[PDB]
Design a protein around this ligand. Structure first.
Ligand code: FEC
Ligand code: FEC
Ligand code: FEC
Ligand code: FEC
Ligand code: FEC
Ligand code: CL
Ligand code: NA
Ligand code: NA
Ligand code: NA
Ligand code: NA
Ligand code: NA
Ligand code: NA
Ligand code: NA
Lengths: 250, 238, 237, 251, 237
C-alpha cells in the first residue's frame, strides 16, 4: 500500500548496434578512415563531458547475434541524452551501426534500505549518495545487461505486498548482492514510465562467471524466485577506443 | 458497464528517421522537403486555431522512434486524411513507421455544453518539456478480472486511483484515450510534464494502488522531449 | 455437446500498406494505367456481387497497421483464392504491401430460408466505418469455455445476444467462424455510421460474462468507407 | 513412475511454406519465366520418381491468405534425404521468387496409446497395414489444413503429469470423434518433440474444407483438446497440380 | 540453497541462413574465392582444436529457421568474440544471414579430475545429427522450481539423470549454463547417429516430473553433420 520512493541520478541509454559488414566492406580505406576519425572526435566529446562530471559512457563488444556493440551513456538530462543520440546517428559511421535494441532508465536509489542517516540533510549533498546516483563506470573486463520487472501474477503480486514485506525481501536480496563485493558491481536504472520493464540492470565484473554465480544465487532468493520477470540478457567485453580501428579493419 | 463521454479522435504516430538515406540527398532537395513539411504543419496549426483539433511533436528517446506526431481531430475521416497527407510528403519516405495508436479522448462516469467537460474532451495540449505515452488494458485473468467486478467495487478502485492522480496536479497532466474497438489495448495514456521524473513517480505510485497492482496490463512506454516546428531544420541538418 | 453451425460465404480480410516511396517514383501516365487496371478489377468484383456469387468492400484503415482493407466474400475457397491471385497480379498490387490477413466463413450457430440466406450470404452495408478483430474463447484453468456444459454456454450466448439486439440500427455484425481456417476461432466484422458505437458495443460486451471471462482478442482495425471515386484522390500525390 | 508414450516412426516430413514475390517475378521477361518454370517442372518430376520407387511422397497446395501462397509438403526416409531436397529446391532459379514464410519438421508418428496391430513378437514395421500409416500415400483431396500443436503443462491442466491409463482414455475418446469422420477427413500426425517448436504437426485432407471446421470444433469440446491442446498457426489450402503452375505464374 | 556449478568452455551456437538469391548473383569465381577464405578460416579453427584450446563443428539445419549452425567452444569470452568477429568479416558471411544465436558455458552442477575436464572441455563427437534447444525452469504459481527446497530438487534431478544415463552411447549431451549470459537458463546440445533418439529421450524426459512440471522450452533445431570438405558442394548451384 505504501509505494517505494527513490532518489534518481543520471539518465541512461543502453544503445545496442550490429555492424553492417557487407556495406562497410564496400568502402575504400580512405573513407573508412574518415569515418573512424569522426567517431574518435565524437568519443573525445564524450570523454570531455565525463571529465567535467556531467556524465559517463563506455563501450562493450556484445557476444552473439543480438548485437556487436553496446554504447552505454549517462547524462544529467533527457535533453542532453537525446542530443547525444542524435549526434551519434548523424555520424557517417552510424549508417553502418544498425539499431538492434535500446533501453532508457535513470540511476535509482530506492528507500527500501537506508543510504544515509535520517535527519533533515539533503541526500543529494551526501557525497557517498552522489557516488551512487552519478556512478563512475569501472573499466571491468565484462558487462552484463538485462531489464526486469516484478510480477503481478495471481498470488505472486509484488505490488500488492505491504511495505515491510517488500523491505524484508529486498533486505535478503541485498545480503546476497553484498556478498559479491569486489567481484560484481551493479548499476540499477529505474525505468517505470520510461521503458518497457521496470528496471534496467547493468553488472560489471572482471570474471563473467561471477554474473552467472550472482544471478543464479539470487534466483533461489524469494525476491527473484517468486517475483522476478526477466527480459533478454546481453554479455560483453570491454572495448577501448584503441581497439576500434582493429575491429573495423577487415 | 461503464459509460463514457467521447471527444477528439487521436493518433499517436511514431517515426524513425532514416539518416542513411537522408544523408544521400543534396542540401537543396533536403530544404525542399523540409519546406513542404513546414507548410503541412502550418496547415495543422490552422486546424488547431479554429478549434477543430490539436497536434504536437516530441523527440523520442531510444531506438523505438525518433519522433512522435500526436494529432487530434473531431472525426476519423479528418484524422485519416491527416495521416495520408503526411505519408504523401516527400520527407515521409525518410520517416519510417515504428508504432501507432488510435484512441478517442474519454471521460468515464465512474454536458457536452459544459465548458469544463469540453476542456477535457477537446484538450488544449500543454507545451510541457516532456511527454510519456503507453497503452494499457485491464486484466481478465483468473481471480484478477476487472470486468467481472461489480460496479460498486470498480467505482471504489477508480476513486482511490483518482486520489493519487489529484496529488500530481500541477506536475503531471494526463490525457486518457479510450481504444476499446479502435486498437489493441483498452486505453492510450499520454502524460505531460516539465520534469520527466514525475512520470516515474506517478506511474510507480499508481502501480502500488490496487486498481493497477492487480488489474493493469501495460504495453510499451515512450518518453520524449518537446520539439517545435522551428527546430526541425536543425534536427534534420546533418 | 459441440455447437453446430450453418456456414455461408468464405471470407478474406486483406490488409495492405501503401508503398508511397515507390509509388512516388512512377510518372503520372503509369500511375493512371495501374489505376485503370484496378478499376477493371473492381468492376469484375462488382459483377460477381450483382449476380449474387459474392461480396466485397474497401475501407481505409487508421494508423500504421494498414492503409486499406479489402474484404471479399465468395462461395468457394477456390474462388476466394483466385480473387487473391488476380489481385496480387495487378500492377498496382506491387505497391500494396501485405500487413495482415484473415480467413473465415460466415457462421450461424434452412439454406432455402430467405432470412437465413440474408445472414449466410450477407449484403455488405455501405456504412461509414468498419471495425475488425479476431477472437477466441479461453481454455485457461477455471475459465475454460470448452469444458462448460451445453446449457451453461447456451445461457452465456443468450445474454450476449441481448446486448447485441440493443444495438439494432447502430451496429451490424458479420461473424466469421475460423476454427480450422485461421489462428483464432472467429473473425468479427462490425459496420456502423458512428465509430463510437464500436467502442460502446465492444465495451458493453466485455462486461458480459461470456466475454469478460472467456474472450481472447487479437488486434483491432478501424476504418472509413473508401468508394472507387475516392481511390484516385488517395493515390494522387 | 510415469510411463512415457512410445512411438513407431515413419517418413521424415517437411512442410515448406512460400510466398510468391510477384513484384520481382513481374520484372522477368516471358522467356526467362518459362525457363525457371521448366527447371521447377524437372525438379517435381524427379520427386515423382522418388515417390514411384517408394522412397517418399510430396504434394503442393495453394494457401489462402497472406501467411503463404504455396506449401510444399515433402516426406522422405531420412533427414539427409529431406535436407537435400530442401537445398536442391532453394537452388532452383525460381526459388528466389518463393520467399520462405514458415516451415515445420516432423516424423510420421504412430503412438502406442491404442494398438495398431496384434501384440506378439512380430516386427510391426513388416505389417503392411502399419506401413501404410507410417509411409502414407498422400490422398489428392481438394483441400489441406496444417497446424502444429502441443499438450499443455499448465497448473492443474498438465498432460505430461497424467498417468498412462488416463492419457489412454483421453486419446481413446479423441479417436472416437476422429473415426466418425472416416471418408470425410484424413489425418497425418507428425511427431516433432526434439525436431521443431511444437510437439506435433497435424495435416488434414478433405474434399470439403468445412469438414476441417467441423472436426476441429467438435474435438475442441473433447476433454483431450479442451483442457490440454495448445495450438499454433492454421494454414488452409487448395490442391495444386504441377500442370497448373504455369497458369498460376502467368501474370 | 542455490546450486553451484563447475564451468568450462564458453560456447557460441551461431545459426545462419544462406542468402541463395544474392549468392546466385555472384560469379563462380567470386564464390570460389569466398569459399577458399572460409576454408582457411576453418582450418585455423582446427589448429585451435588440435592444441586443445577449443572445439567447433558445423551441421546443416533442416527447415527455414537456418541452413547452418556453427558451434564453437573457447576458453574465454574474448577468444569467442574474436572468432565471431573474424567470421562476420569473411566475405562469404555477407551471404550467411544471422537467424539465431546462443551464448552459454559448459556446466557441471553439484547436485583436476581428468574426468571432470572431459565434461567441461568436451570433445565434439562427429555424430551424424545434432539437436539444440534452450530451456529454463518454471517459476509459475505452484510450479516454481526455484522455491523448492534443495532435497526435493535433488530428488527431481536424480530421477532426470536416470533417464539420461539410459541413453548413454546413443545420445551425447552437452549442457551449457546460460543464466546471466542469454535469454534462457540452459542451452542443450544433443548428438546422435539416429535422430529418432532425440525424439525418444526428449519425450521420455517430458513425462518425468522435473521437466513435466518445471521445464520451459525455446525453439528446437535439428541438423546433419557437415564437414568442411562438403561446403563447396553445398554452395555450388
Ligand atoms: C545481479 C543483480 C540483480 C538482477 C537479477 C535478480 O535480481 O535475480 C539485481 C536486481 C535488483 C532489482 C530488480 C532491484 C530493484 C528492486 C525494487 O526496487 O523492487 C534491485 C535493488 C537493489 N539491489 Fe540488486 N536489485 N543488487 C546486486 C545485484 C543484483 N541486483 C548487488 C551485487 C547488490 C549489492 C550492491 C549494493 O550494495 O547495492 C545489490 C543490491 C541492491 C540494493 C541495495 C540493498 C542493500 O544495500 O541492502 C537494492 C535496492
Ligand atoms: C497516469 C494515469 C493513468 C495510467 C495508468 C497507470 O497505472 O499508469 C491513469 C489511468 C486511468 C485509466 C486506465 C482510467 C479509466 C478507468 C476505467 O474506465 O477502467 C482512468 C480514469 C480516471 N482517472 Fe486516471 N485513469 N487519472 C490520472 C492519471 C492517470 N490515470 C490523474 C493525474 C488523475 C487526476 C485528475 C483530476 O481529477 O484532476 C486521474 C483521474 C482519473 C479519473 C477522475 C478524474 C475526474 O473526473 O476528476 C478517472 C475516471
Ligand atoms: C460485436 C459482437 C461480437 C464480438 C465479441 C466481443 O466481445 O467483442 C460478437 C461475438 C460473437 C461470437 C464470438 C459468437 C459465437 C461464439 C460461439 O460460442 O458460437 C457470436 C454468436 C452470436 N451472436 Fe454475436 N457472437 N452478436 C452481435 C455482435 C457481436 N457478437 C450482435 C449485435 C448480435 C445481435 C443480433 C441478432 O439478434 O441477431 C449478436 C448475436 C449473436 C447471436 C444470436 C443471433 C444468431 O442466432 O446468430 C449468436 C449465436
Ligand atoms: C483434426 C485432428 C486433430 C487436431 C485438433 C485437436 O483438437 O486435436 C488431432 C490431433 C491429434 C493429436 C495432437 C494427437 C497426438 C496425441 C498424443 O500423442 O498426445 C493425435 C493422435 C491421434 N489421433 Fe488425432 N491426434 N485423429 C484425427 C484428427 C485429428 N487429430 C482423426 C480424424 C482421427 C481418426 C483416425 C483414423 O481412423 O484415420 C484421429 C486419430 C488419432 C489417433 C488414433 C486413435 C485411435 O485410432 O483410436 C491418435 C493416436
Ligand atoms: C542440473 C541438470 C540439468 C538442468 C536443470 C537444473 O540444473 O536444474 C540437466 C538438463 C538436461 C537436459 C535438458 C537434458 C536433455 C533432454 C531434456 O530433457 O531436455 C539432459 C540429458 C542428460 N543429462 Fe542432465 N539433461 N544431467 C545432470 C544434471 C542436469 N541435467 C547430471 C548431474 C547428470 C549426471 C552427471 C553427473 O553429475 O555426474 C546428467 C546427465 C544427463 C545425461 C546422461 C549423461 C551421461 O551419462 O554422461 C543426459 C542424456
Ligand atoms: Cl553502504
Ligand atoms: Na556480437
Ligand atoms: Na536534484
Ligand atoms: Na530516439
Ligand atoms: Na493507415
Ligand atoms: Na495466399
Ligand atoms: Na581459432
Ligand atoms: Na534449412
Amino acid at each position: 500500500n505504501e509505494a517505494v520512493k527513490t532518489l534518481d541520478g543520471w539518465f541512461c541509454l543502453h544503445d545496442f548496434r550490429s555492424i553492417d559488414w557487407a556495406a562497410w566492406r564496400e568502402l575504400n580505406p580512405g573513407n573508412q578512415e574518415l569515418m573512424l576519425n569522426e567517431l574518435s572526435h565524437f568519443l573525445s566529446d564524450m570523454e570531455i563531458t565525463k571529465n567535467i562530471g556531467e556524465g559517463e559512457h563506455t563501450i562493450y563488444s556484445i557476444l552473439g547475434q543480438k548485437a556487436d556493440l553496446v554504447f552505454f551513456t549517462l547524462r544529467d538530462s533527457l535533453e542532453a541524452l537525446n542530443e547525444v543520440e542524435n549526434r551519434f546517428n548523424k555520424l557517417a559511421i552510424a549508417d553502418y551501426l544498425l539499431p538492434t535494441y535500446s533501453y532508457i532508465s535513470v540511476v535509482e536509489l530506492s528507500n527500501y534500505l537506508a543510504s544515509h542517516m535520517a535527519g533533515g540533510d539533503d541526500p543529494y549533498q551526501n557525497k557517498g549518495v552522489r557516488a551512487r546516483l552519478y556512478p563512475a563506470l569501472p573499466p571491468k573486463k565484462h558487462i552484463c545487461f538485462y531489464p526486469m520487472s516484478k510480477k503481478r501474477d495471481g498470488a505472486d503480486n509484488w505490488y500488492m505486498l505491504p511495505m515491510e514485506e517488500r523491505q524484508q525481501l529486498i533486505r535478503d536480496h541485498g545480503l546476497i548482492g553484498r556478498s559479491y563485493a569486489g567481484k560484481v558491481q551493479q548499476i540499477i536504472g529505474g525505468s517505470i514510465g520510461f521503458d518497457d520493464y521496470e528496471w534496467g540492470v547493468t553488472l560489471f565484473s572482471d570474471d563473467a562467471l561471477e554474473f552467472k554465480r550472482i544471478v543464479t544465487e539470487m534466483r533461489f532468493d524469494e525476491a527473484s524466485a517468486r517475483y522476478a520477470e526477466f527480459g533478454s540478457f546481453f554479455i560483453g567485453n570491454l572495448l577501448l577506443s584503441e581497439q576500434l580501428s582493429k575491429l573495423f579493419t577487415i
